[PDB]
Amino acid sequence: MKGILGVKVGMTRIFRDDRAVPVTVILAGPCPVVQRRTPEKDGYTAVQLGFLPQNPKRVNRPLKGHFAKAGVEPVRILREIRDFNPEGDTVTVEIFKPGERVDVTGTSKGRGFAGVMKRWNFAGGPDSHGAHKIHRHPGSIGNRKTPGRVYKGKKMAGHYGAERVTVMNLEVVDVIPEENLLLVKGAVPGPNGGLVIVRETKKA
Amino acid sequence: PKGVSVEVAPGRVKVKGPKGELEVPVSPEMRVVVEEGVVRVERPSDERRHKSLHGLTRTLIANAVKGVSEGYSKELLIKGIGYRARLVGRALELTVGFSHPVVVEPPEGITFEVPEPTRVRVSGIDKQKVGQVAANIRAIRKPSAYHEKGIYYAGEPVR
Amino acid sequence: KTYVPKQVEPRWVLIDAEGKTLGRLATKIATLLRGKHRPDWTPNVAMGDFVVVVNADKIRVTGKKLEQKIYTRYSGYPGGLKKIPLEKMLATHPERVLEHAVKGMLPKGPLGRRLFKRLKVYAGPDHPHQAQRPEKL
RNA sequence: CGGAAGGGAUAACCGCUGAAAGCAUCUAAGCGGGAAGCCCGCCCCAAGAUGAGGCCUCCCACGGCGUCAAGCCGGUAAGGAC
RNA sequence: GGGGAGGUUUGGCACCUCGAUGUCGGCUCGUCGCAUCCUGGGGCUGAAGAAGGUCCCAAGGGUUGGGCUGUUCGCCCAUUAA
RNA sequence: CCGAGCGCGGGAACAACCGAGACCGCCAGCUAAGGCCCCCAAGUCUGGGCUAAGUGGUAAAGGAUGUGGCGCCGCGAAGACAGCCAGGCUGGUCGAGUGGCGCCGCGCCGAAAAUGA
Numbered sequence A: 001m002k003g004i005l006g007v008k009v010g011m012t013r014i015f016r017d018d019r020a021v022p023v024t025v026i027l028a029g030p031c032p033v034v035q036r037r038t039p040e041k042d043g044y045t046a047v048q049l050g051f052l053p054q055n056p057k058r059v060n061r062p063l064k065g066h067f068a069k070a071g072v073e074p075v076r077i078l079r080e081i082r083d084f085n086p087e088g089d090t091v092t093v094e095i096f097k098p099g100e101r102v103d104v105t106g107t108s109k110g111r112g113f114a115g116v117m118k119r120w121n122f123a124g125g126p127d128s129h130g131a132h133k134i135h136r137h138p139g140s141i142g143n144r145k146t147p148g149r150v151y152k153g154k155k156m157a158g159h160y161g162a163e164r165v166t167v168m169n170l171e172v173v174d175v176i177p178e179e180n181l182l183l184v185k186g187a188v189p190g191p192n193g194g195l196v197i198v199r200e201t202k203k204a
Numbered sequence B: 001p002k003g004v005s006v007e008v009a010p011g012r013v014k015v016k017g018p019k020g021e022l023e024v025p026v027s028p029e030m031r032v033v034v035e036e037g038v039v040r041v042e043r044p045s046d047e048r049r050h051k052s053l054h055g056l057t058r059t060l061i062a063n064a065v066k067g068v069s070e071g072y073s074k075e076l077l078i079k080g081i082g083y084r085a086r087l088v089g090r091a092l093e094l095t096v097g098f099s100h101p102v103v104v105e106p107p108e109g110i111t112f113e114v115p116e117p118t119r120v121r122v123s124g125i126d127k128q129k130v131g132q133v134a135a136n137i138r139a140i141r142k143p144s145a146y147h148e149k150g151i152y153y154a155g156e157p158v159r
Numbered sequence C: 001k002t003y004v005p006k007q008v009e010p011r012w013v014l015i016d017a018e019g020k021t022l023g024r025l026a027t028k029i030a031t032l033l034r035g036k037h038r039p040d041w042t043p044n045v046a047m048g049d050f051v052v053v054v055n056a057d058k059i060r061v062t063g064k065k066l067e068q069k070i071y072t073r074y075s076g077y078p079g080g081l082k083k084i085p086l087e088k089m090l091a092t093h094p095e096r097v098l099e100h101a102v103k104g105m106l107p108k109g110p111l112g113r114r115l116f117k118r119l120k121v122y123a124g125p126d127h128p129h130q131a132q133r134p135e136k137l
Numbered sequence D: 001c002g003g004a005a006g007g008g009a010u011a012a013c014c015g016c017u018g019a020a021a022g023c024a025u026c027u028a029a030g031c032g033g034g035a036a037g038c039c040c041g042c043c044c045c046a047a048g049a050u051g052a053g054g055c056c057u058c059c060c061a062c063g064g065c066g067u068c069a070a071g072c073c074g075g076u077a078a079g080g081a082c
Numbered sequence E: 001g002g003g004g005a006g007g008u009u010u011g012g013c014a015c016c017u018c019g020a021u022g023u024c025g026g027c028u029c030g031u032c033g034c035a036u037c038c039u040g041g042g043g044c045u046g047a048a049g050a051a052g053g054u055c056c057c058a059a060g061g062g063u064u065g066g067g068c069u070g071u072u073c074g075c076c077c078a079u080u081a082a
Numbered sequence F: 001c002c003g004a005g006c007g008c009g010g011g012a013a014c015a016a017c018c019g020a021g022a023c024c025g026c027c028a029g030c031u032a033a034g035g036c037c038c039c040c041a042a043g044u045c046u047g048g049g050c051u052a053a054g055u056g057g058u059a060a061a062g063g064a065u066g067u068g069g070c071g072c073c074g075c076g077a078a079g080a081c082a083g084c085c086a087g088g089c090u091g092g093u094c095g096a097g098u099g100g101c102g103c104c105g106c107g108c109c110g111a112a113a114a115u116g117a
């Protein structure tokens, strides 16, 4: 159940055999496993990789007593990658062979208070003939005396984006073990410089 | 019910013979007995449901007996041109009009023979189980009704 | 002027569910929950025993229930219907079938719910042994 | 990039064995197959789940009134806020 | 000839509303029902196959763009799995 | 009867259905309708049956080897019905009941609707 943390670094395309390939580049620095979660102590199994190199200064926390309790140069972030227990002390791009399909998780760019038109690809009014103050409005939201209420979940405008977005099943292209790069099929959430986590898919 | 090894119990009955060993879940409120080299089953009343339950056990048993006696088996014809079947190890492959030969691995307690590519005998200690796998085979290609083709038993052709 | 209880220590109990008709069982568990077998009963107060049940998963139930009986659970939304048949219940978390039926014979207020909290259910046994436990029937 | 796969339980329906009712029957005891649907599985939210869960880790006694009891006032710890 | 279900039509009644419950069609946003148009599963067929017919099961999702009319509806054009 | 008893009890809730005509007070008693497993006061009361549909938890013409109870007609130990062997009812073998009608009780199907049951 491989997995590694990374940062959307950027993307460009590259040429394979004889066709262009849109790739996004994740840098997936050597993640120091920092705790492991057993079926006995924790009740479920997984593994806590750290990520960015941290100033032993800003780690003044009780956090020291964690890194210390596993002798790991203090990282910046650390998330668990459920149901996957490795070896050594660190996970690296090497879990990924080119052609393996991965699911990358990310955090969608944040659009703030979003129009129903942008948030739901709603139709909205007519630029022309009729009224002019409902141009981008959702229009009707209900019925009459029955129900005589709005349904929960009704699509309405408001803070949208900047949320946990997993885009399943992209193809790993050439992984640069050297500079710690991981090449993929482009479609990966959040802005450049964002934390992301890559994993094995569900194809079969 | 002779030459055998019938052994009562609360809700079930152990039936042993050369062939094998069968656990035969019987009603608890029935009374299976063991007269001589044979077996009885007597009923606690004459209520509609005790009768139903009665015969059903008095057969469910007999079957378990003969089941470790001569044992059980069924016969499968495989008519129609192309249609045939090679036995392979334990499980039997069989090509039958499909674009894919069907490999049918054998349930435990079962074993089937292919005397001829056109015939298939299913042997096992257990009626119910035999009967199933039997039909379970006929199923791969039920008998057409516009021409003799596919698996039959040894009963009329639908015509 | 009618007697009125002062504070008291809560009696506990232990029950074995195996073989019990689920409802017939709930009824009692209920009547225990309200301090209602005690003769110094007081409505407004909640001096009920602390009924503890075990071997829930084994609860007998008459007729076709298991298959036939459906548990409605209305989420907030369009088509939040959610019908759950009696079996799926026991098959996954089964304590509920019992819980989901004492809550039912308990009255409705804040007290009712104070009470539902006294009742403690496991399919087991192996309840957190602690002290009291005077088995019943 | 996605709709799946897959596991499980079922619908009509197809059956294995079998009485009642010597036969016959899918059923009444029992069992197998069987849906884009049900439950799972994937994605997201989520412990105000007041039934407030778990793990790892860091800080740690009293300095004065209330006679047992709940507290009250202060400078602090980790740590947090401005 | 007979018995029903539904409460989408046309009505009957005149029960709330005449110190006001804005009307048809469209748009926008839908969500439910199933008596299912498609897709899935099936029975019979006067089912060779292919295509169909009739009935059963199944709401999960889907259910196009134009011409004419304020139209709903309907006709028509070009498609469609529908 | 409500109106004027939208005062009280029952009926989930509900002017007129069931009970009953509220002068005031009571931390007394009997009852009424309706009830006595829990929410909910009082029987998990006693005895005899019926029903396996959640019927009860409230739909028809019509349909059906549901189930139990009763009544009548037909063949049967001179061998019947059921199958199994032979022939086109006959025979045997088996060996005790079998076929049809009719009436009552409870039930089954007929039974599709729109916010969550």
Ligand SMILES: [Mg+2]
Pocket: A058
């Ligand atoms: Mg920081």
Ligand SMILES: [Mg+2]
Pocket: A123, A124, A125, A126, A127
């Ligand atoms: Mg526009």
Ligand SMILES: [Mg+2]
Pocket: A130, A131
């Ligand atoms: Mg205007």
Ligand SMILES: [Mg+2]
Pocket: A133
């Ligand atoms: Mg205006």
Ligand SMILES: [Mg+2]
Pocket: A145, A146, A147, A148, A149
């Ligand atoms: Mg409303």
Ligand SMILES: [Mg+2]
Pocket: none
């Ligand atoms: Mg037979």
Ligand SMILES: [Mg+2]
Pocket: none
């Ligand atoms: Mg048969």
Ligand SMILES: [Mg+2]
Pocket: none
């Ligand atoms: Mg809650």
Ligand SMILES: [Mg+2]
Pocket: none
């Ligand atoms: Mg100190």
Ligand SMILES: [Mg+2]
Pocket: none
């Ligand atoms: Mg000190």
Ligand SMILES: [Mg+2]
Pocket: none
């Ligand atoms: Mg300081």
Ligand SMILES: [Mg+2]
Pocket: none
């Ligand atoms: Mg400090």
Ligand SMILES: [Mg+2]
Pocket: none
């Ligand atoms: Mg800060």
Ligand SMILES: [Mg+2]
Pocket: none
């Ligand atoms: Mg009109």
Ligand SMILES: [Mg+2]
Pocket: none
């Ligand atoms: Mg009038």
Ligand SMILES: [Mg+2]
Pocket: none
């Ligand atoms: Mg007004």
